[PDB]
């Protein structure tokens, strides 16, 4: 349970 | 950490 959040 | 940022 992994979660990618991008930011820039 | 679950969450990961990625820049």
Redesign the interface.
Do not use: E, L
């Given at each position: 349970?992994?979660?990618?959040?991008?930011?820039x | 950490k679950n969450v990961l940022y990625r820049r």
């Open positions: 349970s992994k979660t990618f959040i991008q930011v | -």
